Amino acid sequence: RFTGLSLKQTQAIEVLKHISLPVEVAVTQSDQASISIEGEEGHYQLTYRKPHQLYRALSLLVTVLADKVEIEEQAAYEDLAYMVDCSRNAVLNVASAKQMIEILALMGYSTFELYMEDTYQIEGQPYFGYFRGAYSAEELQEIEAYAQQFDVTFVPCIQTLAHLSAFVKWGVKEVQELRDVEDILLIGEEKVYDLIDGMFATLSKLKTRKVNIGMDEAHLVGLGRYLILNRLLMCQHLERVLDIADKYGFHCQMWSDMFDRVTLVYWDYYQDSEEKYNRNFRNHHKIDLAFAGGAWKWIGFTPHNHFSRLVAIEANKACRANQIKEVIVTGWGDNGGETAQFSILPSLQIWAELSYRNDLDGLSAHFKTNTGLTVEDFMQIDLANLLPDLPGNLSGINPNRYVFYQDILCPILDQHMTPEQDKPHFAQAAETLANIKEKAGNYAYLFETQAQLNAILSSKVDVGRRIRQAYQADDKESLQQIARQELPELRSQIEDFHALFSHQWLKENKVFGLDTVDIRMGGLLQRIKRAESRIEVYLAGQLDRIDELEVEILPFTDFYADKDFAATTANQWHTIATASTIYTT
């Protein structure tokens, strides 16, 4: 029995019943605090500064009530947002954007963002998003309106310069004419500014007038086809993009890195101290700033919520000591979008709590009411990354992925495994994750996938090495065993994982982009088979040496060579899977 609620808010609370609502609530828009709940004896007054904040208050309300309740919150940040990568093969389907929106609402996010390089349609640009599951402006309007039900703002993150590799690869004149080098558009070229105009044109059919135009990471701007036909140049390009946006009413932000009518966004997912962020905040202001932090979900199949917690704590302290008014939580999907979309919910609760309380005092409490599980449990999703000899402050260490896609015969990451410490971690993690799966409810699909992965990894982490040992020691028992029993088994487990991945994928994303995963997994299964077949041939007398095994394994990279753990970072499938050429001509 609420009071002072509008139509829209009453429907919102309805859709939001994630929550179990137990009470009389006087609801008033007050500048008193971000969120005030005050009351007792089953009658409460809840107020909010911003309308969207009704929904976190509600969650806190329902968490605190487990009668006298007195809660104030003054957020640090005027805007908190979550940005989903829909450009790395995984395009979040509508039904999942909605569930996502509902959950961000309950946490306290004001803004929802989709990063689409080429995954939104443009009229008369039919190779822009071709077979990519590009969003229709319907889908973008439907999604935006759903967020609007909760007073949540939609900001498109797009690209107007570089990161356009999947559009520009198409070899028709009308595309090729737009290029300069690699993934970067031809600045100054008129065709380009007509494409960009179609972009904002398509964006203009939504209600938001806030956009992120991208412009990160274009090392080679004007060094290919530009240099050929005709740096400064960026500003020329930028003012133009701005003139275009200002034509359709848009306010623009862009990623800072290549560096008054645009906010710059200093993005940093990596620093383990206040100091480090503080220094770069100095350097940034020195050119209107937002901060993008990281919900680590771009390192293979498995997230890193633990590492996201650590860096979020110190970036929050830096954000506030530099009175940064806007923070963006980024969920990138580097190299295939293979990590689950809902993998990083703890990272999202963490940032909200840090904004609304400057601490993680009520994290698990709020998280459980929003998800139906404790934040310690959910965060076990990271297990395949959490090797026990790693310090929690070094980023991107991702065995989840490079243990999985490594070849058997030619195991080029074998120097980065520590099987005595690794094999048991993975096994028991599979055990822990099966447990959690059973209480995870609608999220169970997430943990089912990680449990099978961890199972595969306990075995796979050193089959390649044991093959090498069993072969230099001439042991026909072991090689025959690996070849006739263990490798075929691995393939079976891997088929199972594929099935679970596919289900996870289709639940969260559109069908498009899954094909890359089918290909990569198909290939792995086929390399496993070669290992079985090559051994059998060596076993039937028909082969002198197994040459692949005669190769001494070097370190894969020296990125973390000077550290006291063997593991490392390796996030390109193609250099994981083979030392041969696969992409080059």
Ligand X SMILES: CC(=O)N[C@H]1/C(=N/OC(=O)Nc2ccccc2)O[C@H](CO)[C@H](O)[C@@H]1O
Name residues contacting a second copy, limited to 85-114 (CB under 8 A): 88-89
Stretch 391-410 residues interacting with a second copy (CB under 8 A): 407, 409-410
Q: What is the CA radius of gyration of the chain?
A: 26
- The correct pick among 17, 477, 542, 581 for binding a second copy (CB under 8 A) is 581
Q: Which of the 8 DSSP states describes residue 120?
A: B
Binding mask 219-258 for ligand X (x = CB under 6 A): ------------------------------------x---
- The correct pick among 95, 145, 321, 582 for binding a second copy (CB under 8 A) is 582
Shortest distance, position 29 Cβ to a second copy, whole Å: 42
Which residue has 């969260």 as its token pair? 508
Q: DSSP letters of 370-415?
A: HHSS-HHHHGGGGGGG--TTS-TTS----HHHHTTS--SSS-TTGG
- The correct pick among 224, 372, 392, 419 for binding a second copy (CB under 8 A) is 224
Which residue, 294 or 336, has its beta carbon nearer to a second copy? 336
Residues in the chain: 585
The site for a second copy, by CB under 8 A, has a size of 72
The verdict on 41 binding a second copy (CB under 8 A) reads no
Binding mask 437-466 for a second copy (x = CB under 8 A): ------------------------------
Cα–Cα nearest to 497, from 537, 459, 542, 442: 459
Stretch 188-217 residues interacting with ligand X (CB under 6 A): 216-217
Shortest distance, position 334 Cβ to ligand X, whole Å: 5
Please state whether beta strands 35-40 and 43-48 pair in parallel, antiparallel, or not at all (unpaired): antiparallel
Stretch 299-358 residues interacting with a second copy (CB under 8 A): 334-336
- The correct pick among 38, 334, 486, 536 for binding ligand X (CB under 6 A) is 334
Strand partners, 263: 253
Residue 70 CA: distances (Å) to CA of 43, 78, 366, 581: 12, 23, 16, 63
Residue 60 CA: distances (Å) to CA of 77, 180, 357, 408, 448: 18, 52, 12, 51, 30
Q: Which of a second copy, ligand X, none does 20 bind, CB closer than 5 to 8 A by kind?
A: none
Question: What span, in angstroms and rounded, lies between the C-alpha atoms of 512 and 498?
Answer: 16
Q: Which of ligand X, a second copy, none does 554 bind, CB closer than 5 to 8 A by kind?
A: a second copy
Q: Which of the 8 DSSP states describes residue 122?
A: B
Dihedral in degrees, nearest 10, Cα atoms 390, 392, 396, 399:
40
The verdict on 296 binding ligand X (CB under 6 A) reads no
Stretch 519-538 residues interacting with a second copy (CB under 8 A): 519-527, 529-530, 534
Handedness of CA 132, 135, 136, 142 (dihedral sign): positive
Exposed, middle or buried by CB within 10 Å (0-12, 13-18, 19+), for 159?
A: buried
Q: Which of a second copy, ligand X, none does 216 bind, CB closer than 5 to 8 A by kind?
A: ligand X
The verdict on 415 binding a second copy (CB under 8 A) reads no
- The correct pick among 278, 478, 480, 571 for binding a second copy (CB under 8 A) is 571
- The correct pick among 8, 43, 169, 205 for binding a second copy (CB under 8 A) is 169
Q: Which stretch binds a second copy (CB under 8 A): 166-174, 256-264, 441-449, 481-489?
A: 166-174
Cα–Cα nearest to 378, from 313, 429, 443: 443
Give the three-class secondary structure for 91.
Answer: coil
The site for ligand X (CB under 6 A) is made up of 216-217, 255, 267, 298, 332, 334, 585
